[PDB]
Amino acid sequence: KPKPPAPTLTVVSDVATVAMEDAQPATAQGVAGGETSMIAPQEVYAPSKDTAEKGEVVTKAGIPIAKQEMSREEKLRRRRREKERIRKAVQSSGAYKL
Amino acid sequence: WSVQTGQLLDRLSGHEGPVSSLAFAPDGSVLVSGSWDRTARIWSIFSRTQTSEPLQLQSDVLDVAFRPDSKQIAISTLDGQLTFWSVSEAQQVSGVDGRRDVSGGRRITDRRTAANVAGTKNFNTIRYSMDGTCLLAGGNSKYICLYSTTTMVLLKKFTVSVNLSLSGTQEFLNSKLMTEAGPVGLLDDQGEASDLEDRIDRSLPGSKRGDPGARKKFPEVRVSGV
Amino acid sequence: MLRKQARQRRDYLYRRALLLRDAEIAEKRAKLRAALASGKPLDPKIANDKELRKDFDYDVSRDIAKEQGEIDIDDEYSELSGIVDPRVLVTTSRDPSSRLMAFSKEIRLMFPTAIRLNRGNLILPDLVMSAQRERLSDIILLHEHRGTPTAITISHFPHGPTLMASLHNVVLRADIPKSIKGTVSESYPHLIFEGFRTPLGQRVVKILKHLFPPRDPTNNAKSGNRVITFVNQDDCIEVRHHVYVRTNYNSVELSEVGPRFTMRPFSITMGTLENKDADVEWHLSQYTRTGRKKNYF
Amino acid sequence: SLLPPDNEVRRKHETLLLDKLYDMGILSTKAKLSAVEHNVTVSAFARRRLPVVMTRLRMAETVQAATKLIEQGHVRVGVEEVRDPAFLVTRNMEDFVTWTVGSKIKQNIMKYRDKLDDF
RNA sequence: GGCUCUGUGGGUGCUUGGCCGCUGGCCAGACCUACUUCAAAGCCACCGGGGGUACCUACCGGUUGGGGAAGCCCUAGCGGC
RNA sequence: CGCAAGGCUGAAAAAUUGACGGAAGGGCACCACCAGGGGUGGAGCCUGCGCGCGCGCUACACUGACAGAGCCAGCGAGUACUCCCUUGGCCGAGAGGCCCGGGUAAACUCUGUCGUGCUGAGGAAUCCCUAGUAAGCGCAAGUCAUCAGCUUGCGUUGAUUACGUCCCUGCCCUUUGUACACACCGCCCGUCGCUACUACCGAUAGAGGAAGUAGGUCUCCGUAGGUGAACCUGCGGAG
Known part of the structure; x- marks a missing residue:
């Protein structure tokens, strides 16, 4: 029985895949290969709420929309969708009588 | 998954x-x-x-x-x-x-005739051709067989290695290499080494699948993948 | 495969015997740990054992872990407790009747992950063989008298215990009309057990609550709409199967959806359904003097 | 043992060490570290060797006959024939040690039981 | 005529000589014992686990009595720091 | 032994996390569709459940009756097992024992003899069933609960038709999470609560009512000082 799986993280850079290749006089890839930057566009930049602007929000689509230009109906619907995700996870006698 | x-x-x-x-x-x-x-x-x-x-x-x-x-x-x-x-x-x-068709054997440390050695008489791996007309078959033995899948005959047999430093590459070992203390490729000759890191035997007793010690003197011939 | 089942059952029985001897020693070692922390003087037969102190220095930590409950006891259920969904097949006797087959369907529908199998001509060792060959967790056999069921046999696999019980007061699902009943919801049921206090009661509680798939523990206290109740009086465990809506924060409307039993267990054997020669753990002692006075579970 | 008794890495490596030794069949229990004190033993390794474990499984009669039979090469462990009489058989390969394919010992057992199928 | 046992030779890897104090000799051997300037660089080097340490040994730091390589200086000496 | 052990009393909330839905898209199901099969329900018997209801059992003819021939199982061994009760007689002083009367399969295969003859296979509904499964057949046991009005095993013979789809009936789940590359998708919708703030209404600064928003290195030279030959620092010049 091998071992219990314990979490291990590996730090990859933004270098091309011919930096992960082994040492040899020339690459095995062509000229098109060798520009693939070993981290996807989702790791180069992903639009999210932690990297958004102050006035704006980002949607689920990855599009900045501002709270000022958003209408009341869309504000209510966005509040409902976030709430749906959260759900998924002795006095006086005159004062008495009168 | x-x-x-x-x-x-x-x-x-x-x-x-x-x-x-x-x-x-x-x-x-x-x-x-x-x-x-x-x-x-x-x-x-x-x-x-x-x-x-x-x-x-x-x-x-x-x-x-x-x-x-x-x-x-x-x-x-x-x-x-x-x-x-x-x-x-x-x-x-x-x-x-x-x-x-695949039985070719008699390793060192094998007290059977190469015809009676069971264990090198099976096909551990088989692959069809990209045509689909000929299997290729290889086991823990010296021979690779290339069968036809329609006519069911062996088209061609190959020998993987002529190398006698490997262990199972000839089915009839010669009696010149049999002393009165077992075969001559079996006596532990580590002690006649000038270097200490060559003299040290860090091997584990009874480890068929790999150990980092790995004496590995005269390894067997086996085709593990085709 | 069969050699592995036999070897693992023999290793389990040997480990249980070693646990008996080690418990006889570890009742003495827990006095030495409590006297070390509190300073009350202990017995000389405990304090003058050099082997006990020399081994106590290595075996502190499992006693501390058992005190905190960080480890679980060597059991046939603790290997796969909440990891695998226990699959379970329900079968009849050899030539069932129509009401026994409809009752088999009803108590299949009681478990959300169960399957039903037609017996026909199926020899019982090959039934056990096919269960171990398809890695079933539980089998449940049914016995009828004349269109009314009279016995269950709940057997845990690969080598686990049988609980054989006799059924009384069975009111079937198949008696009420389809206008009043309906298709039973198959959600993962809540379970409640009421009145089990002896270690034998916790044994039967374990071999009854490991028939059901494990509930997702994120919001299980409020979600889920279906409950199954095992409550015993006079060691005859009575079981109901309800479905509920929470009509307010203070009130709840129940609706009886499944069959009603009062099963009484009469045999709990440490060994599967094929082993008639397995060592029993408990059996209903009739024809003794005070076997009717004494209440187990 | 020398770690403090309420330590997390002590408890985790106790369970790992006992599970590893019980899976290799050296210890007979996995609930005491005194087993690794005075029960792990070169005799326990040497009785987890192959001719003694097939003496126990009654594949042979005695360890001498078992060493002779696995030097002549009748015994495979799993799918591979074993010629080394020092191959340490673990607890889950004791369910897979059996005779080889064209074994005369297997023909002898089948001829005794009168099930000698010549096909 | 047959079985068994035993012995010798060849084969069971691709064919370049027997020996020596080997660029030359010898297989019948021959000659016998010379010649010499300056001991050495360091490191590593596998004994099963826990424990004891009186004695021996290893390592480190010292103590008495002798010993003086080398470094420094100059009143030059059998010198001095 | 001390405390518990003194009745503004007289039966039938939480929430920035909550309450209920809808639409779209998936997954599954002989409690669904589709194709077939089989029960029950008609007559009689009876356990059981509350005269009624089903569950078993039996009878109901082409798959026939009679006579032959041949050929097949598996589970089953506690000095233990027996179906009654009686008319007579034996030996019985008496209790009894005797004798004689009365109430290892089915199936299957083959060969002949006769020929539909109170000698009639179950309505509406409702339920179940997908491979050694449905259905037929016998043999054995009787295991501390249940079971002789039966139960549970065990062998034998062994099909038709589905093995697709969510269209109907439903059940479960997505619309939050739980992993990253390719690749794809692209802010699901409603009725209210709760909280914060803002102003309003009117009785006595105030509890309510109603509403909205969220850039000079190296070397040399001339200097001036430093601890003086030299040498160091600072500056001014040339290479």
Whole structure:
């Protein structure tokens, strides 16, 4: 029985895949290969709420929309969708009588 | 498991022994498992009914391979025989008894004649051609066999190594190398070494599959993949 | 495969015997740990054992872990407790009747992951063989008298215990009309057990609550709408199967959806359904003097 | 042992060490570290060797006959024939040690039981 | 005529000589014992686990009595720091 | 032994996390569709459940009756097992024992003899069933609960038709999470609560009512000082 799986993280850079290749006089890839930057566009930049602007929000689509230009109906619907995700996870006698 | 999801889809079951060879069909419809319960299974997973048709064999299944045009499958057992089954109507259509065609042996530390050594008489791995007309078969032995899947004959046999520094490359060892203390390629000669890191034996007693000690003097000949 | 089942059952029985001897020693070692922390003087037969102190220095930590409950006891259920969904098949006797087959369907529908199998001509060792060959967690056999069921046999696999029980007061699902009943919801049921206090009661509680798939523990206290109740009086465990809506924060409307039993267990054997020669753990002692006075579970 | 008794890495490596030794069949229990004090033993390794474990499984009669039979090469462990009489058989390969394919010892057992199938 | 046992030779890896104090000799051998300037660079080097340490040994730091390579200086000496 | 052990009393909330839905898209199901099969329900018997209801059992003819021939199982061994009760007689002083009367399969295969003859296979509904499964058949046991009005095993013979689809009836789940590459998708919708703030209404600064928003290195030279030959620092010049 091998071992219990314990979490291990590996730090990859933004270098091309011919930096992960082994040492040899020339690459095995062509000229098109060798520009693939070993981290996807989702790791180069992903639009999210932690990297958004102050006035704006980002949607689920990855599009900045501002709270000022958003209408009341869309504000209510966005509040409902976030709430749906959260759900998924002795006095006086005159004062008495009168 | 699923690749795009990451979590475990299922544990299929119905085998009475450890499952030795798996093969998905090249069109994508049928898994075939082969296991040491002397059995194989045509698993149909992707349909709405998940079903398992057994193929009962004569000994432990060692290898499973598909034809590229997926109507045929060859499964190689522990007797040394290849059986060519059909996958649509699960009937054996062909068969080769291939013990003699692959039996080439007599390692050092082997007190049997090379004809009587069992263990180097089976096909551990088999692959169809990209044409689909010729199997290629290799086991724990010196010979690679290339069978025809229609005419059922051995088209060509190959020898992997002439190298006598490996252990099982000739079936008749000569009696010049047999002293009165066993064979001459068996006496521990580590003590006649000038360097300490060559003299030290950090080996574990009884470790067939690898140890970092790894004496590895006269390793066996085996074709582990084709 | 069969050699592995036999070898693992023999290893389990040997480990249980070693646990008996080690418990006889570890009742003495827990006095030495409590006297070390609190300073009360202990017995000389405990304090003058050099082997006990020399081995106590290594075996502190499992006693501390058992005190904190960080480890679980060596059991046939603790290997796969909340990891695998326990699959379970329900079968009849050999030539069932129509009401026994409809009752088999009803108590299949009681478990959300169960399957039902037609017996027909199926020899009982091959039934056990096919269960171990398809890695079933539980089998449940049914016995009828004349269209009314009289016995269950709940057997845990690969080598686990049988609980054989006799059924009384069975009111079937198949007696009420389809206008009043309906298709039973198959959600993962809550379970409640009421009145089990002896270690034998916790044994039968374990072999009854490991028949059901494990509930997702994120919001299980409020979600889920289906409950199954095992409550015993006079060691005859009575079971109901309800479905509920929470009509307010203070009130709840129940609706009886499944069959009613009062099963009484009469045999708990440490060994599967095929082993008639397995060592029993408990059996209903009739024809003794005070076997009717004494209440187990 | 020398770690403090309420330590997390002590408890985790106790369970790992006991599970590893019980899976290799050296210890007979996995609930005491005094087993690794005075029960792990070169005799326990040497009785987890192959001719003694097939003496216990009654594949042979005695360890001398078992060493002779696995030097002549009748015994496979799993799917591979074993010629080394020092191959340490673990607890889950004791369910897979059996005779080889064309074994005369297997023909002798089948001829005794009168099930000698010549096919 | 047959079985068994034993012995010798060849083969069981691709064919370039027997020996020596080997660029030359010898297989019948021959000659016998010379010649010499300056001991050495360091490191590593596998004994099963826990424990004891009186004695021996290893390592480190010292103590008495002798010993003086080398470094420094100059009243030049059998010198001095 | 001390405390518990003194009745503004007289039966039938939480929430920035909550309450209920809808639409779209999936997955599954002989409690669904589809194709077939089989019960029950008609007559009689009876356990059981509350005269009624089903569950078993039996009878109901082409798949016939009679006579032959041949050929097949598996589970089953506690000095232990027996179906009654009686008319007579024996030996019985008496209790009894005797004798004689009365109430290892089925199936299957083959060969002949006769020929539909109170000698009639179950309505509406409702339920179940997908491979050694439905259905037929016998043999054995009787295991501390249940079971002789039966129960549970065990062998034998062994099909038709589905093995697709969510269209109907439903059940479960997505619309949050749980992993990253390719690749794809692209802010699901409603009625209210709760909280914060803002102003309003009117009785006595105030509890309510109603509403809205969220860039000079190296070397040399001339200097001036430093601890003086030299040498160091600072500056001014040339290479």
